[PDB]
């Protein structure tokens, strides 16, 4: 039995790191950093500090308003019963506006609250995105986080804003609930003929599978070479060590090709962003330009034809 580098056996404690000095024009960091023993078992023990600039407080306030609108509406749906609130929490939702209103502003009685929560949640997410951009720039680091985040926002925006805008109805958008938004997801595929046959849904799943596959490969590869300092990836990129060589050689000998320490994270970055990028395009296509994906599959020779175990059933409604 050898050490598998799953949990840190010996943690050390010292002064907390306050972060690299930010350039002038930045707010002071908030919070007093502390050490969490159980977090240090897996990774860094230090919790905080956090940066709360104008973007952070504005995004928190906008997100707080959206959550409060959702939560108070779900609480009101169970007659303000906290017992029924907890019991029915996965089933409750802030329902999207009724289809009769189209894109017009709906009353509070028929989905006006959903539009406000969607607006404030979108503002919170957008303000969080620029904060992700700003925090990277202020440290001098590249803005890879912000643009990977933009891909996730892209699917979020098409799901609740862009596609309902194209369909001309806020009713096409996702309810703010746990089970109801699963119902919407199931109903969306059912309405547009088996979203399995959406080729961009296929692509999104391939990248979602690939992203999970890549992190399984990359996480295991780095842990298997962490005995040679493989976890210090940026140091390996600048100054290649035997950990990078062993990591590349393992995959070169396995599947005939390999990446570098830097380029594997380019594979990781692109596979993740392509999951939501392809997914957002696929969602944007259905209802606007394709209305039955299975029939699109049979039109393009995608859907298999199965042998008839029963005679074809005539539609009794003529």
């Amino acid at each position: 039995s050898e050490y598998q580098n799953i949990f840190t056996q010996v943690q050390v404690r010292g002064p907390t790191y306050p972060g690299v000095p930010l350039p002038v024009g930045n707010e002071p960091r908030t919070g007093k950093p502390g050490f969490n023993y159980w977090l240090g078992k897996i990774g860094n023990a230090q919790l905080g500090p956090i940066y709360l600039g104008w973007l952070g407080v504005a995004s928190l306030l906008c997100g707080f308003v959206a959550i409060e609108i959702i939560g108070l509406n779900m609480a009101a749906s169970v007659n303000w019963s906290p017992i029924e609130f907890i019991r029915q929490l996965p089933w409750l939702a802030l329902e999207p506006p009724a289809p009769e209103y189209g894109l017009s502003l709906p009353p509070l009685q028929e989905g006006g609250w959903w539009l406000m929560a969607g607006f404030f949640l979108t503002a919170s997410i957008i303000l969080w995105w620029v904060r992700s951009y700003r925090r990277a720039v202020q440290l001098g680091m590249g803005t890879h986080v912000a643009w990977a985040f933009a891909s996730a926002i892209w699917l979020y925006l098409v799901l609740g804003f862009i596609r309902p805008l194209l369909m001309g109805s806020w009713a096409e958008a996702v309810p703010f609930g746990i089970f109801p938004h699963l119902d919407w997801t199931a109903a969306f595929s059912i309405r547009y003929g088996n979203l399995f046959y959406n080729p961009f849904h296929m692509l999104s799943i391939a990248f979602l599978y690939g992203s999970t596959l890549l992190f399984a490969m990359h996480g295991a590869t780095i842990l298997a070479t962490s005995r040679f300092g493989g976890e210090r990836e940026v140091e390996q990129i600048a100054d290649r060590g035997t950990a990078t060589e062993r990591a590349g050689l393992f995959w070169r000998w396995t599947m005939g090709f390999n990446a570098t320490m830097e380029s594997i994270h380019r594979w990781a970055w692109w596979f993740a962003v392509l999951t939501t990028l392809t997914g957002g395009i696929g969602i944007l296509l259905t209802g606007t330009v394709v209305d039955n994906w299975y029939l699109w599959g049979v039109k393009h020779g995608v859907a298999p034809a199965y042998p008839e175990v029963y005679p074809p059933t005539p539609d009794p409604a003529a």
Binding site: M141, G142, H144, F149, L208, M217, E262
Partner: protein, 274 residues
């Protein structure tokens, strides 16, 4: 044929079976004994799939379908053109997947690496054998496995999902999806983090170390897991996604037959709020 740093590592030993006889390379690929068995099972399985494609109605890549036998055949071997070919390919696939994992073990030993990658691949193999062996075994028929076709097995997923009227309500499926979503979210963050420090915002800027990596996430989300933690967590999320996927499909049918939303009535009928 060799990377500029590859020559020193191309040494003997580390094999499990065969030892010296199969210890060589063909181009970039290491062979080993399990590489030969991987090639044997891969060629046999691929050839039988192509043969089933040739004997099928169409050569359309999306429409090629090697279906499992009928449920009436139970756990026995069906005729080759009535699902028996699928059964043979399934054995070849399992032989190829296990040989591939064992080949990775030999390469890991030869390089002094840990066995994390073959173990992580074992979770993927476990999900496949759950879909193709364990769940059909618990249901009593090999015809419960998914067919071998690019689009036919997607139809299988849809029909199995709707065999429980709402597969989103499956509790283990809910956990598995969240892990799949979490590992992609973590992968995007981790790839972005490493690229951000190795590719600074201003071109030709000093490269950033782990302090900037920690500081950005502490500035951004208030916590940084560190370079070691993200690979531990990323592997954990990916393996949890694979593991809970096997759980979610193995409990559908063998241990739950009704609609998945029915299952949540235990929570609604708890004596604290009944």
């Amino acid at each position: 044929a060799l990377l500029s740093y590859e020559r020193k590592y191309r040494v003997r030993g580390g094999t499990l079976i065969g030892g010296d006889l199969f210890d060589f390379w063909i181009g970039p690929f290491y062979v080993g004994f399990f590489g030969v068995t991987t090639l044997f099972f891969s060629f046999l399985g691929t050839a039988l799939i192509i043969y089933g494609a040739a004997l099928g109605p169409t050569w359309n890549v999306w429409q090629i379908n090697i279906a499992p036998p009928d449920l009436k055949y139970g756990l026995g071997l069906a005729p080759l053109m009535d699902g028996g070919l699928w059964q043979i390919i399934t054995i070849c696939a399992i032989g190829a997947f296990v040989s591939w994992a064992l080949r990775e073990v030999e390469i890991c030993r030869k390089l002094g690496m840990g066995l994390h990658v073959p173990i992580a691949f074992g979770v993927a193999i476990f999900a496949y054998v759950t879909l193709v062996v364990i769940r059909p075994l618990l249901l009593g028929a090999w015809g419960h496995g998914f067919p071998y076709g690019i689009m036919s097995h997607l139809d299988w997923v849809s029909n199995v999902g709707y065999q429980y009227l709402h597969f989103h309500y499956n509790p283990a499926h809910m956990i598995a999806v969240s892990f799949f979503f979490a590992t992609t979210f973590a992968l995007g963050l981790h790839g972005s983090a490493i690229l951000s420090v190795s590719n600074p915002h201003k071109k030709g800027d000093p490269i950033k170390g782990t302090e900037h990596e920690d500081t950005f996430f502490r500035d951004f989300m208030g916590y940084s897991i560190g370079p070691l933690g993200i690979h531990r967590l990323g592997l954990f999320l990916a393996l949890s996604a694979g593991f809970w996927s096997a759980v979610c499909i193995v409990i559908s049918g063998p241990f739950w037959v009704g609609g998945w939303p029915e299952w949540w009535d235990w929570w609604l009928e708890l004596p604290i709020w009944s």
